[PDB]
From Swiss-Prot, chain A:
SMART domains, A to Z: AAA, ClpB_D2-small
Effect of D179 to A/D/F/N/L/Q/S: Confers resistance to prion-curing by guanidine
Modification Phosphothreonine occurs at: T494
Record bears the keyword Secreted: no
Inducing or repressing factors: By heat stress dependent on the heat shock transcription factor HSF1 and the general stress transcription factors MSN2 and MSN4. Expressed at a higher level in respiring cells than in fermenting cells. Expressed in stationary phase cells and spores (at protein level).
Keyword Isomerase: no
Region spans: Repeat 2: 83-145
Cross-link (Glycyl lysine isopeptide (Lys-Gly) (interchain with G-Cter in ubiquitin)), chain numbering: K437, K615
Motif mapping: Nuclear localization signal: 768-784
One GO MF term: ADP binding
Organism of origin: Saccharomyces cerevisiae (strain ATCC 204508 / S288c) (Baker's yeast)
Name of the protein in its database record: Heat shock protein 104
Similarity field: Belongs to the ClpA/ClpB family.
Cellular localisation: Cytoplasm; Nucleus
Curated annotation (Swiss-Prot), chain B:
Descriptive protein name: Heat shock protein 104
Residue span relative to the full protein: 365 to 545 of 908
Highest taxon in the source lineage: Eukaryota
Positions where Phosphothreonine occurs in the chain: T135
PTM annotation (Phosphoserine): residues: S171
Name of encoding gene: HSP104
Protein source organism: Saccharomyces cerevisiae (strain ATCC 204508 / S288c) (Baker's yeast)
Family: Belongs to the ClpA/ClpB family.
Length: 865, 181, 177
C-alpha cells in the first residue's frame, strides 16, 4: 500500500530479471518470472487463489511467454518501462487488485494473476487462475489480504489467519513504538543463548507478573532482528498471540486450535524467522486442560518451530508437576526482581518516555526515591511496574496539576477568570452606567496585565510544549531516523543511513541543543517556563500518599533514622513506663532497620510482661512506632493444638483442603505487611512442634506456602513473649532489676522450656513493677489522650485533673493483677457515665472543665459542669 | 566446535557431584547441552568485536558529511573530516579483511563442520543401506570412501586450528572450555 | 455491486413504477432518490450528497423525478419495475469504485461511485444523478471501508453513519437536558 512491498505477479513481470532480452514489455505480464514453476512457492504459481478449479497448467509457458519469452527489447531497458498488452494495461495492472475480489494492485496469491491483466490471452481462450473475478473461489487463500499497506508481502502466505495468527511487534519494532526498556539482559542473552539449544529447547521464565518481558525479550530479539545472534536464532523470529484466537477467534472449539495447528504447518516449512509467542500454558491447559492446541506440539515439537512462553512463580511449580514429559521438551529458567538502582536505571530510562507523552520534567531524584517508599507503601503490586505506576501517578499527579493547562490559572480560573466573569457577568442588569448597584466593569482594568501573563503562562507550558513537542519528537524521530539510519545498519549496511544521517544527528540535536537551551523564564523555576509546570514530586508523592493511606508529612518527613534516632527518646514520650526495654529494643530497633549484620534476620525479645500491661502497650507503641500503623496487628493462637495448624500454620495444605488461603489468612497479612513485628503469647503454652513450626520462623523465617511461597524477614519482625513467670512476676519486692533472680525464671523457663533454638534467637526482655508515682501520671495520659481523638470541637478541654480521683483512680489504679490496664473502661465508664448526664444536658458545650468532689469511699464522682 | 574430553568427563563428575539430582546422563546431557550453550553465542561471530570495531564507521561515518557542512575553522572541518575518515578508512582495514578471515575460516570451520555434519549423515544413510541387505551394504559404503573424508576433516580446520591468530587461534575458541562454561 | 441491504432505496424503483407497474421502469428514478427522508434523500439531503452532492438539494431531482415511471399501460397487478438498460448500469460500476477500502462487497455508494451517463431527472453537470462529487467520491471523501455486514441502507450509499443506538453525552445536556 506504499511501495517496494511486493507485486505478486506484477513484481515478477519485468522484474524477474533486470535486462537481458528486454522481456519486461510484452502482451502478458508474466515475463521476468512466471509464478516460479507450476505451484506457488513464489508469485501466483500453479494452483493458487487464481483458482482451485481454474488455473494455468501450461500457463507457465503461456503466461510468461506472452509475458516475455524475451528478446522484444533492443536494450536492457529496451522500452520505456515494459509496455505491452498487459504491460500498457498497467493502468489495470494495479487494477488487477482494483475492482472487487482483488486488493489495491494485487496481494497475497491474488498478487499473482490479476495484476498480469492480459496474459495467456488478454482474456480470450484459456483456463488460468483469476484476480478479482476468476479468483472468487480462490479468494480464500490467494485472496484474503484485506491489509495491503505497511507490511511486506514476501512469502506467499495466502489465506492463513494472519492478524489473528499473532503479532510480531518487530513490526512495532519496525515502528519502534514499543519501549526499549532494558538492562536485565544476560538472562535473556543466556535465554537467548539458551534459546539456541538443540535437543531440548525453548526456555521460558518468570518472576513478577504481567507486562510481558517478551517484547522485552523481543527487544534484543529485535536487536536480534538487528541480528545480535548467530544465523539460526538470528534467522528466527516470532509473532504474538495466545488469546486472541480464543473463543472469539473461532465460533466454538475444533478449528479453534486447529487452524493454528494447521497454521503451524505453514510456518514449519523452510520458513526462517519463525518462533512462537506464548505467555502462559497457565492460560493454557485448564480445569479440563484443553490440550489447547498444545500437547500435540510437544509431539510436533519433533520437527521445528520453537516458541516462547512465561512461567509464573509458585504456580509454575503447580505447572511443573503436571507433566515433565511435557516439560521434557521446553527449557525453563526464571526471573529476579530488580529494584532501586536497577529501577533507577528505568527511572532514569523512563523520564523521557512519558515526558515523551505527558511532557513534564521533574528533578525527579527524590521522586525516584519516592518509589521505594511508595514501593514499600503498596508493594504487593509489581515493584517496578508498580513503581512504574507511580510514574503514572506522577503524571497523574501532574495531569492533576495539569487538567486543562498545568496548574496555575485553571486554579486561578477560580479567581482571574471568575474575575473575568466580573469583567463580563454583570454587563447588563437594570442599569449600569456610572453610579449604580451594577459592579461589572472594574475588573477589566486590572486582570488585563494579569490575564495577559496568562498568555506567557499559557505559552509557558505551551510554547515550551511547542518546543517540547519537537523535544519529544526530536530524538523520537531520530529514534525513527537513526533507526531509519539503523534501517539497515545491522546488515553491515552503512552509508544509506549515514546519507540522511549526515548532519541529521548534528541538526536535530543541534535544534535540541538550540532549543533545549531555551528558557524564557524570568527566572521562573529552572531553565524553562512550565515543564514541571510547577510540579513537585513530593507533593504528588504526597498525593500519592494522599491517595495511598494519606497520613502524610511524616511521610514527607523521612529521615527514618533521624526520625527514629530521636523517636526512642521520643516514643519514650509515648512510652508507658519501663524504659530500657525501649532502650534495649531501641538498639534492636536501630539495629533493626539498620540491619547491616544479616539480610535475613529480625529480632525478638523475651519481653517479659504483664497482661495488657505494657504488653499490649508495646505492640501498639511498637506498632505506633514503625509508622502510625495500627493495621500492623499480628498474633497467633493454635499454641492450642496437637496436630492442627493449617490456617494456623501458614501452609495449610495444598489445594484440596479447608480454604485455599493456606495461611493466606496469616499470609495475605504476611503479604499485606512486608514490615511488622509479631508477638503471640501462649508461646509459653505453645504447641512445641508448632514451635518447630515456629522454628523456621526465625532467620529462615522465610515463608513456605501450601503453594510454595517464601518470605524473608527482618522485613516484619517478632517479639513473641509470655509471662509464664510468677516468682519474679509476682516478686513484689524488686521491680526494675532487683536480682538475678531475674535470670532464674528467665534462665530456666527458656532453657527449661525451650531449646538451642532460642540460643539462635534474639533478645531477652521483661517488664518491671510499677511505682504508683510512675504509675500515677500515666493516668491522664490515656485520659488526656481521650478528648484528643474526638472529631468535633466545642468543649475539648482539660476538666478534672489535679489529684482528686487520680488517687481514687490510683486506689483503683494498678491492682496486683492489673486493676490498671482495664481501668480505661472502669475509668471511662465513670467518665462516660458523668459526661453522659451532662452530654445529656450539656449545660454549656464549652465551659465545662471541672474536677470531681468525689460511698464509704467518700467518692462516686460526677461533676458540676 | 572442537572438544576437549577430560573436562566433559570431569565436568560430568562434579556436574553429577555439584548437581546430583540430574540423573547420571542428564546432568551431563545438561553439560552437553550447556556446553553448547556457553558455546552458543560464543559462536556468535565476534559479538564484542562485532559491535566494538564496527563503531569506527559510525564514529567517523556521520562526520564524513556532517563536517562537510559545519561551523568550524575553515577547511580544518574538512581536515578533521579527512583525517578521521583517514583513520576510519585505515583502521577499518587492519581488521577489514581480518574479521572475515576469522569468520571466513570460521565458515571454513563451519564449512568443514558441515562436512563433519555431512560425513556421518551419509555414513548413517550408508549403513542404512545395510537395510538394503548386502546389496547396498558395502557398495555405497565403499563409494563414501573415507580414506580421506576425515583425513579431509581433521587436516582441514587443522590449519586454522594450527594457525593461531596471535594466540589461541579462534576467539571463537570453539572447543571445550574446560570448566569455565 | 450495490449490496444485500439495497431493498429500501432499491425498493422505490417499482415504487416509481407504482402508478401502474411497468414492463420495466428505468434507472432514471427510484424512492432511493427520496431514500428514507422526505426532502433531498439521505445522501443528497445530508448523508453523502448533502453538502457536495450537486443537484437535487431537497426537491431538485426527486420533486419532478416521478414523471418517467408514472402510470402503466395495462397493469391490474402484472409487474412492477426493472432496470433493463440500467440492469447492467451499475453492475460493474457497483464493484469498480470500491478499490481497497478495507471492506467486503459491492457498494451502493460504491454503485454511487460513477453515477450514470444519463439516468435521472436533473441537468447538473451531466444526465447523471444529483450533480457531482457524491457517491463513491463523496462517500470516499465522506467515509471509507464502512457500509454494513452483508448489506445496508436500501437504494443509495446509506444514511447510516454512527453506531445505531447512541446515548448522548455532548449534545445530551448541551441543552441542559
Ligand atoms: N529494563 C527495563 N527498563 C525500563 N522499563 C522496563 C524494563 N523492563 C520492564 N520495564 C517496564 O515494565 C513493563 C515491561 O513488562 P514487564 O512487566 O517487565 O514484562 P513481564 O514479563 O510481564 O514482567 P512482569 O511479569 O510484567 S513484572 C513496561 O511497562 C516497561 O516500561
Amino acid at each position: 500500500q506504499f511501495t517496494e512491498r511486493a507485486l505478486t505477479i506484477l513484481t515478477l513481470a519485468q522484474k524477474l530479471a533486470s535486462d537481458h532480452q528486454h522481456p519486461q514489455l510484452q502482451p502478458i505480464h508474466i515475463l521476468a518470472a512466471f509464478i516460479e514453476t507450476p505451484e506457488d512457492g513464489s508469485v501466483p504459481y500453479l494452483q493458487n487463489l487464481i483458482e482451485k478449479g481454474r488455473y494455468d497448467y501450461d500457463l507457465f509457458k503461456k503466461v510468461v511467454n506472452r509475458n516475455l519469452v524475451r528478446i522484444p527489447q533492443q536494450q536492457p531497458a529496451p522500452a520505456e518501462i515494459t509496455p505491452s498488452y498487459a504491460l500498457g494495461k498497467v493502468l489495470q495492472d494495479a487494477a488487477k487488485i482494483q475492482k472487487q475480489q482483488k486488493d489495491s494492485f494485487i496481494a497475497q496469491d491474488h498478487i499473482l494473476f490479476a495484476l498480469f491483466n492480459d496474459s495467456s490471452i488478454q482474456q480470450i481462450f484459456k483456463e488460468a487462475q483469476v484476480d478479482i473475478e476468476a479468483i472468487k473461489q480462490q479468494a480464500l487463500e490467494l485472496r484474503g489480504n484485506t491489509r495491503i499497506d505497511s507490511r511486506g508481502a514476501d512469502t506467499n502466505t495466502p489465506l492463513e489467519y494472519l492478524s489473528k495468527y499473532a503479532i510480531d511487534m518487530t513490526e512495532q519494532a519496525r515502528q519502534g513504538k514499543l519501549d526499549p526498556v532494558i538492562g536485565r539482559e544476560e538472562e535473556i542473552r543466556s535465554t537467548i543463548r539458551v534459546l539456541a539449544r538443540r535437543i531440548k529447547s525453548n526456555p521460558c521464565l518468570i518472576g513478577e507478573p504481567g507486562i510481558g518481558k517478551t517484547a522485552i525479550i523481543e527487544g534484543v530479539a529485535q536487536r536480534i532482528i538487528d541480528d545480535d545472534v548467530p544465523t539460526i536464532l538470528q534467522g528466527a523470529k516470532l509473532f504474538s498471540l495466545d488469546l486472541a484466537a480464543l473463543t472469539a477467534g473461532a465460533k466454538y472449539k475444533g478449528d479453534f486450535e486447529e487452524r493454528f495447528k494447521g497454521v503451524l504447518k505453514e510456518i514449519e516449512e523452510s520458513k526462517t524467522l519463525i518462533v512462537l509467542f506464548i505467555d502462559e500454558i497457565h492460560m493454557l491447559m485448564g480445569n479440563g486442560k484443553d490440550d489447547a492446541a498444545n500437547i500435540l506440539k510437544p509431539a510436533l515439537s519433533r520437527g521445528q518451530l520453537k516458541v516462547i512462553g512465561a512461567t509464573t512463580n509458585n504456580e509454575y511449580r503447580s505447572i511443573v508437576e503436571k507433566d515433565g514429559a511435557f516439560e521434557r521438551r521446553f527449557q525453563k529458567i526464571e526471573v529476579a526482581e530488580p529494584s532501586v538502582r536497577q529501577t533507577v536505571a528505568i527511572l532514569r530510562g523512563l523520564q523521557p518516555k512519558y515526558e515523551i507523552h505527558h511532557g513534564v520534567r521533574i528533578l525527579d531524584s527524590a521522586l525516584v526515591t519516592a518509589a521505594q517508599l511508595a514501593k514499600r507503601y503498596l508493594p504487593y503490586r509489581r515493584l517496578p511496574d508498580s513503581a512504574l505506576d507511580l510514574v503514572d501517578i506522577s503524571c497523574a499527579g501532574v495531569a492533576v496539576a495539569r487538567d486543562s493547562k498545568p496548574e496555575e490559572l485553571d486554579s486561578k480560573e477560580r479567581q482571574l477568570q471568575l474575575i473575568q466573569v466580573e469583567i463580563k457577568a454583570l454587563e447588563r442588569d437594570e442599569d449600569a452606567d456610572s453610579t449604580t448597584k451594577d459592579r461589572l466593569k472594574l475588573a477589566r482594568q486590572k486582570e488585563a496585565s494579569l490575564q495577559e501573563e496568562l498568555e506567557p503562562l499559557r505559552q509557558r507550558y505551551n510554547e515550551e510544549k511547542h518546543g517540547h513537542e519537537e523535544l519529544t519528537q526530536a530524538k523520537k524521530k531520530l529514534d525513527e531516523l537513526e533507526n531509519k539510519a539503523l534501517d539497515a545498519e545491522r546488515r553491515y549496511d552503512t552509508a544509506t543511513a549515514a546519507d540522511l544521517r549526515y548532519f541529521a544527528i548534528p541538526d536535530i540535536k543541534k535544534q535540541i541543543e538550540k532549543l533545549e537551551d531555551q528558557v524564557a523564564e524570568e527566572e521562573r523555576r529552572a531553565g524553562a517556563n512550565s515543564m514541571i509546570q510547577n510540579v513537585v514530586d513530593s507533593d504528588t508523592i504526597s498525593e500519592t500518599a494522599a491517595r495511598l493511606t494519606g497520613i502524610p508529612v511524616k511521610k514527607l518527613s523521612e529521615s527514618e533514622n533521624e526520625k527514629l534516632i530521636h523517636m526512642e527518646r521520643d516514643l519514650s514520650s509515648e512510652v508507658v513506663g519501663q524504659m530500657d526495654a525501649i532502650k534495649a529494643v531501641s538498639n534492636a530497633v536501630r539495629l533493626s532497620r539498620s540491619g547491616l549484620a544479616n539480610p535475613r534476620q529480625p529480632a525478638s525479645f523475651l519481653f517479659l510482661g504483664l497482661s495488657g500491661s505494657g504488653k499490649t502497650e508495646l505492640a501498639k507503641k511498637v506498632a505506633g512506632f514503625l509508622f502510625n500503623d495500627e493495621d500492623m496487628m499480628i498474633r497467633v493462637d493454635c499454641s492450642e493444638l496437637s496436630e492442627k495448624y493449617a490456617v494456623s500454620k501458614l501452609l495449610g495444605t495444598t489445594a484440596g483442603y479447608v480454604g485455599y488461603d493456606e495461611g493466606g489468612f496469616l499470609t495475605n497479612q504476611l503479604q499485606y505487611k512486608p514490615y511488622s513485628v509479631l508477638l503471640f503469647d501462649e508461646v509459653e503454652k505453645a504447641h512445641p512442634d508448632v514451635l518447630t513450626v515456629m522454628l523456621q520462623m526465625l532467620d529462615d523465617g522465610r515463608i513456605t506456602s501450601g503453594q510454595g511461597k517464601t518470605i524473608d524477614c527482618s522485613n516484619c519482625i517478632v517479639i513473641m513473649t509470655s509471662a509464664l513467670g510468677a516468682e519474679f512476676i509476682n516478686s513484689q519486692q524488686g521491680s526494675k532489676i532487683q536480682e538475678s533472680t531475674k535470670n532464674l525464671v528467665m534462665g530456666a523457663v527458656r532453657q527449661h522450656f525451650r531449646p538451642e533454638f532460642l540460643n539462635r534467637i534474639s533478645s531477652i526482655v521483661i517488664f518491671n513493677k510499677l511505682s504508683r508515682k510512675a504509675i500515677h501520671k500515666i493516668v491522664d495520659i490515656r485520659l488526656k489522650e481521650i478528648e484528643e481523638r474526638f472529631e468535633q470541637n466545642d468543649k475539648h478541654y482539660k476538666l478534672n485533673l489535679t489529684q482528686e480521683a487520680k488517687d481514687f483512680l490510683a486506689k483503683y489504679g494498678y491492682s496486683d493483677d492489673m486493676g490498671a490496664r482495664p481501668l480505661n473502661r472502669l475509668i471511662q465508664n465513670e467518665i462516660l457515665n458523668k459526661l453522659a448526664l451532662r452530654i445529656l444536658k450539656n449545660e454549656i458545650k464549652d465551659k465545662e472543665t471541672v474536677n470531681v468532689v468525689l460511698e464509704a469511699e467518700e467518692c462516686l464522682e460526677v461533676l458540676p459542669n
